[PDB]
Design an enzyme around this catalytic site. Structure first.
Site, PDB file in Angstrom:
ATOM      1  N   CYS A 184       0.858  -1.215   0.000  1.00 49.13           N
ATOM      2  CA  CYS A 184       0.000   0.000   0.000  1.00 49.13           C
ATOM      3  C   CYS A 184       0.888   1.257   0.000  1.00 49.13           C
ATOM      4  O   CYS A 184       1.322   1.657  -1.096  1.00 49.13           O
ATOM      5  CB  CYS A 184      -0.983  -0.053   1.165  1.00 49.13           C
ATOM      6  SG  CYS A 184      -2.359   1.114   1.007  1.00 49.13           S
ATOM      7  N   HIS A 232      -3.429  -5.686   0.630  1.00 51.52           N
ATOM      8  CA  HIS A 232      -2.772  -6.201   1.861  1.00 51.52           C
ATOM      9  C   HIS A 232      -2.664  -7.721   1.772  1.00 51.52           C
ATOM     10  O   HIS A 232      -3.550  -8.434   2.239  1.00 51.52           O
ATOM     11  CB  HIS A 232      -3.538  -5.723   3.102  1.00 51.52           C
ATOM     12  CG  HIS A 232      -3.365  -4.268   3.380  1.00 51.52           C
ATOM     13  ND1 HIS A 232      -2.330  -3.783   4.159  1.00 51.52           N
ATOM     14  CD2 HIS A 232      -4.081  -3.193   2.983  1.00 51.52           C
ATOM     15  CE1 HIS A 232      -2.422  -2.470   4.237  1.00 51.52           C
ATOM     16  NE2 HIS A 232      -3.488  -2.083   3.522  1.00 51.52           N
ATOM     17  N   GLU A 286      -0.905  -9.732   3.397  1.00 50.08           N
ATOM     18  CA  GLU A 286      -0.706 -10.263   4.774  1.00 50.08           C
ATOM     19  C   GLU A 286      -2.027 -10.809   5.341  1.00 50.08           C
ATOM     20  O   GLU A 286      -1.957 -11.677   6.233  1.00 50.08           O
ATOM     21  CB  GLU A 286      -0.089  -9.195   5.686  1.00 50.08           C
ATOM     22  CG  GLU A 286      -0.979  -7.992   5.973  1.00 50.08           C
ATOM     23  CD  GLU A 286      -0.774  -6.787   5.066  1.00 50.08           C
ATOM     24  OE1 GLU A 286      -0.546  -6.988   3.859  1.00 50.08           O
ATOM     25  OE2 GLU A 286      -0.842  -5.650   5.572  1.00 50.08           O
TER      26      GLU A 286
END
Ligand code: GTF
Ligand code: GTF
Ligand code: GTF
Ligand code: NA
Ligand code: NA
Ligand code: NA
Lengths: 535, 535, 535
Positions: free
Chosen positions: B379, B507, B509
């Site tokens: 990001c 994202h 993750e």
């Protein structure tokens, strides 16, 4: 078949009638053929009520085995036919006294003696000792949940519930649901807060008994159920009643005994409350009304004469007479004379210790004897009756008890050791407690009433009738109606030139019940009715 | 089959790992073929964590459906395969907002809106919404039992337990059992006191999870059982572990899942923890070791990057590489220079908002590009990589984001509605949240890592790549590796004259698990290993 | 000038070091010239620790007046120069024993004896009895706030605070502020909850002493202040320390004594902690290191020998020697032989009762005597020294104590009543407790060390040296070093063909302090240092 325990606690306030509620529930369970008993756990430090003043505690109740116990065991014996003993009542004082003696002796083998497990173990042991061998044991916890004094009892029964298991243990908690005039509603908030307090000690109540001056409606019971983790059918309304004999019916009416029998897996028939229905009927339908004066020294607390007041009530039931009990301070008879004994259909002088107000009681026994007013004397009531007669008929001047005037010329009442005559001449284990057989003299008023030669009644007295001065009072017209033991101690006296004059050493009030009444109190209230007619 | 609820509460302290414990227990139940879900009830007033700083309560986790949620839902998704949504997380704020909305427009029909029943009903409705249609629902209550903030949650779940029945509801309570150096013993007293507090709110715990820095021994577990109305077998030791992946095994070895399955009458086979045993095995048996620098502005609270830190560890598992994560403050790069980026085998710049420490991240992206150090940008990590390339390669001096310098000549990053070129010319659902399809370019590094033309990753960002200034940066040698949507927004960029340089808008993750890993992070850690070997 | 009270309570856990904290604060207040004392209120039911096992409770501390007390009174005497007596320690057992005896006797005049006012009045009376005539009285309440056992004490001191007034009473409450590894923060939540618990009993704490494994930072102290109605300056950090002698300084450093002196309107000079600074310095700067073996039967709890361990520490201070104290089970000497006594620079055999492990202690006293290893014997340590010598030097076969082998031929140790010779011939108030004067024999090792003809030490022993078998052991080379009383009982023995061999009947450990040390323990640790050099 495992013994089941109902732990009965109180919240919000004391004076909830925990004893009456427990006794009433035991009555229902007994009426289903269950072997039921009750025990009282008192948080006071007194080792027993032996040392407690009638004016501060109320009456010391005496069991068969001669234990001095809380007056609640009176309630228990008046609601169930299981006999109470020492095992049915103990105090914090008894528990701490037990543990201290074991500790000093060395029974704990160098251990740190602690509230848990040592005090709690001592409580659990005595509960099991009183409970085991019954179907259901009601264990009444004295004090209020949230107070310091009852915490060891509450921790002990919490442990018992886990050990024994919840298949054979219930927690029944009484609360106050007070009425507020402003809003015209009964309030569940104290119940909500009391249950949280009980939970904070580790106890989830199973049954809530809601005390109020009126019925607790369904909406309030539903609110209590919602907030307290208790089903609505386990929330019971117990309103103020005009008669405690109605309480078994009110609890059965709400299925309390069904819930308990279900939880404990007990298959037993429906409660037959016919004997209680009979008692309620008798009480509600009196034909006559009498006024009986109870003249004593502990009148500032009526509970001092709890079993006596209830025995008079039972006499009323068996004769269909409403007994208006007037409490008359015996000291007022000394001050203002026998004018305050006017307008009495009968007179009762109950038990007591100390000389204060006794001269008033002697004057009262005289007034009753001279004016042919029905008289019943219990323990101190027999002493003042024997003193009156010896003093005013047998002409023994200043005749008294050694308890009151130790060096009096005519000790007509004294300890067996103190026994002397008028010249100081003597003959060539002092306290008497519990059940003792008494032989009734033939053709005596009591022989008729009891309708048997030998009776069993309960003693709590030190000072006996002096056998050495007895013959001189007998010759003066007095009649020995009952005796006991190898020493042939005077148990009952009568004045035969009188409609109804009886006085006994034992406490007949402790064997009187609403269902079976009492021969002596039945006769006394009958004579009071007959006297009222002749006016 | 009725849905079963396990209400997970915490006592004594917060930071017990309530989320990891609930997640780990969910992992065991899932390994027994049960349909299990978890939900988090947060007592904060924020309607959702969308308006919360990372350094405040940790990372804002994003679900597939684009809900901004507590980071605990990250734990849940990393431990079970049941996907989390909006209805697996709500706050006090959400509950009050919904009730106030309904009240102001008049849904309650003139009623007094109260904590009970109106707030508690709203809580229960949302628990049933997220729970019903599952075998076991774990409901984590945020906050600590005894505090004000969680009381409405606790009252609500107390009601649910009674309504649904105790046949299908359990209370699992975590406590601290702290170690005292002075005595060399762990202390059960806080557990004793916390359980009394929980009981005082109307909840008897069924299971106690005892947190400590070591195993809670048998004696201590028996003492807790004795005082807390909880069977010994329902008192679980959860010591501090080197790896959270071991916790499912620790709980299973104490039969927690057996006790739950028995209580809920669930006939399910023994848990096969092979997948967790494999993760533990991978973790314990690395072949190589790397040091990866995470250069961000929220390093003062590591939990700001919770999912990123765990994603790196999952990268390590799949390569048998032990990842040392060195958290480096990006503002320290601004002051001290690229001196503190030496000795790093790879560099990750995570997401963030605000200009504070961004120039440090731009400098970091430059350092990683010029020295051929493996780089992953997420990001904001992609923004600063585009800024770096635009500013230092494509020669767009002072090139920045409109977020940081609104009136800059080269806004290479800006809102779609701000998009302008260098001369100020223009063309002619602002916030992107949750799962969106992303098309990968044919000759790109990510296309070979993901091994598919299209992927699904989760967004939480406003500021896009300015398409009007993109082609000038593309001609300067920057590769566009991924795009999405009708507006062909740039999702991934790459520097192809570099061993491993990737940066995405989404994202990644949030879709990384320890069992299934993540293609991008697996690739990034491999590149970190390769770079370490070459030095 | 009104006596001031500081009521010291503990929350969250026990093992907080309430005694050390109270003792340390008393040390500061004494160092400002205030007349300070401390008392310990123990919630155990034991009438006193006389009946408590060393292995379960720790050592029975003995005061001058011969009271058997909690080991905390050891802490008190080691921190202040005010002498402790029976009045400085009492148990729940003592209070309930007091009240029960008054009740049975009839001192309450028929009253219902209740926790309030009767138990609380008894507590208040004993507190005033120990406190009155001092400037400041520290009253340590045993147990943890929130537990049943301490509630009567807490209610009693609540009443005292109101009666005496808040001008002359403070509440000082210790709590645990535990560290959580997961978040790397110390937690105030237990303090918050403990203070609410204390308030729920009717006590607002004035001072909070926060125990942790590290300093409690300003932010956490401010949070505690905010939630507990306590000013930040009255929230004190008391971290774990490597030396308890530092605690007075740490408390003064945070102005605790200034706050107390202000609240009680005491104008006194700044605390002179020079003597404590000297002790801290001595301890931190040892020149040598010795290993002293303490060989006894209560080693599984080191606190069994609390004052002995501390007396060795004080010996180390006065010689600038680090004393490594090795605890060696005397039963291991019986099993595995004298190989486990190898590598000891000195040997100490402390007090004890019972035969278990005594043969090991006799073997240990032999090994120490034969190999010229410095020996100190206390009570049972003197018995095994006299037995060893009589048995192995004076050739008295199987010579023992009547406590162990009642019918032994040579009872070298026995009660004054049991005294006999080897042929069974005899001569023509058994327990000795507290301070007794002892006459030291001239030219004796102890006469040198004590540097005076007469000493005062404290006894706790039944079994004496048999004077009838003494002369035969004296002729065999043993030396009587000290005697006492009209009966001339053996207090101290020596072996003069030895570097340092002393054994005493009294407990010298009870008069040893960090500031003034102890002649005997000073000499013992010196001899241990000298032995270590010669190897
Ligand atoms: N644990 C609880 C229980 C209730 N209430 C709140 O209690 C409020 C009602 O207050 P009331 O009318 O005085 O109490 P009542 O329950 O009706 O009991 P009573 O029979 O004495 O009248 C609701 O707003 C509430 F919200 F329900 C509460 O805040 N916490
Ligand atoms: N509800 C209770 C429970 C206990 N205690 C009393 O608590 C005392 C023990 O105190 P400790 O050693 O600090 O407590 P522990 O339970 O062993 O817990 P930890 O594991 O933290 O050490 C007993 O005298 C008692 F009596 F058992 C009490 O008074 N009221
Ligand atoms: N009486 C109280 C006090 C606090 N809180 C709530 O407690 C919450 C904070 O929870 P934490 O972080 O676990 O507690 P801490 O106070 O910081 O103590 P620690 O030092 O152990 O971390 C706030 O939302 C609150 F709202 F402040 C509460 O609800 N009721
Ligand atoms: Na109401
Ligand atoms: Na303990
Ligand atoms: Na906090």
């Amino acid at each position: 078949m495992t013994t089941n325990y109902i732990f009965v606690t109180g919240g919000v306030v004391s004076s909830l009638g925990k004893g009456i509620a427990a006794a009433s529930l035991a009555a229902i369970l007994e009426a289903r053929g269950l072997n039921v008993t009750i025990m009282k756990l008192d948080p006071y430090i007194n080792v027993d009520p032996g040392t407690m003043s009638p004016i501060q505690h109320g009456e010391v109740f005496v069991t068969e085995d001669g234990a001095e116990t809380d007056l609640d065991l009176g309630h228990y014996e008046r609601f169930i036919r299981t006999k109470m003993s020492r095992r049915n009542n103990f105090t914090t004082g008894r528990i701490y006294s037990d543990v201290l003696r074991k500790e000093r002796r060395g029974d704990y083998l160098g251990a740190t003696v602690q509230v848990i497990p040592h005090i709690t173990n001592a409580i659990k042991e005595r509960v099991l000792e009183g409970g085991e061998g019954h179907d259901v044991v009601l264990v009444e916890i004295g004090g209020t949940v949230g107070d310091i004094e009852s915490l060891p009892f509450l921790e002990a029964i919490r442990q018992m519930a886990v050990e024994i298991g919840r298949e054979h243990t219930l927690f029944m908690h009484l609360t106050l649901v007070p009425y507020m005039a402003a809003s015209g509603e009964v309030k569940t908030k104290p119940t909500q807060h009391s249950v949280k307090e009980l939970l904070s000690i580790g106890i989830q109540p199973d049954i809530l008994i809601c005390r109020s001056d009126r019925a607790v409606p369904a909406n309030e019971r539903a609110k209590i159920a919602l907030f307290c983790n208790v089903p609505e059918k386990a929330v019971i309304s117990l309103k103020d009643v005009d008669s405690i004999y109605k309480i078994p019916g009110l609890l059965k009416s709400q299925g309390l005994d069904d819930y308990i029998c279900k939880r404990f897996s007990l298959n037993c028939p429906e409660a037959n409350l016919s004997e209680w229905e009979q008692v309620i009927f008798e009480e509600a339908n009196p034909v006559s009304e009498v006024t009986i004066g109870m003249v004593g020294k502990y009148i500032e607390l009526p509970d001092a004469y709890k079993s006596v007041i209830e025995a008079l009530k039972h006499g009323g039931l068996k004769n269909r007479v409403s007994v208006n009990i007037k409490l008359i301070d015996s000291q007022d008879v000394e001050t203002r004379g026998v004018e305050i004994l006017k307008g009495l259909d009968a007179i009762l002088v109950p038990g007591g210790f100390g000389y204060r107000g006794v001269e008033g009681m002697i004057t009262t026994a005289r007034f009753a004897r001279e004016n042919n007013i029905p008289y019943l004397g219990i323990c101190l009531g027999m002493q003042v009756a024997l003193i009156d007669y010896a003093r005013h008929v047998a002409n023994m001047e200043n005749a008294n008890s050694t308890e009151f005037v130790p060096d009096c010329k005519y000790p007509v009442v004294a300890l067996i050791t103190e026994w002397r005559d008028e010249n100081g001449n003597v003959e060539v284990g002092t306290m008497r407690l519990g059940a003792q057989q008494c032989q009734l003299v033939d053709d005596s008023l009591v022989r008729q009433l009891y309708n048997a030669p030998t009776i069993v009644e309960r003693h709590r007295h030190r000072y006996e009738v002096n056998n050495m001065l007895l013959k001189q009072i007998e010759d003066a017209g007095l009649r020995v109606a009952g005796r006991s033991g190898d020493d042939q101690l005077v148990e009952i006296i009568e004045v035969p030139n009188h409609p109804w004059f009886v006085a006994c050493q034992f406490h007949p009030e402790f064997t009187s019940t609403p269902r079976d009444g009492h021969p002596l109190f039945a006769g006394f209230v009958k004579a009071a009715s007959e006297f009222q007619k002749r006016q």
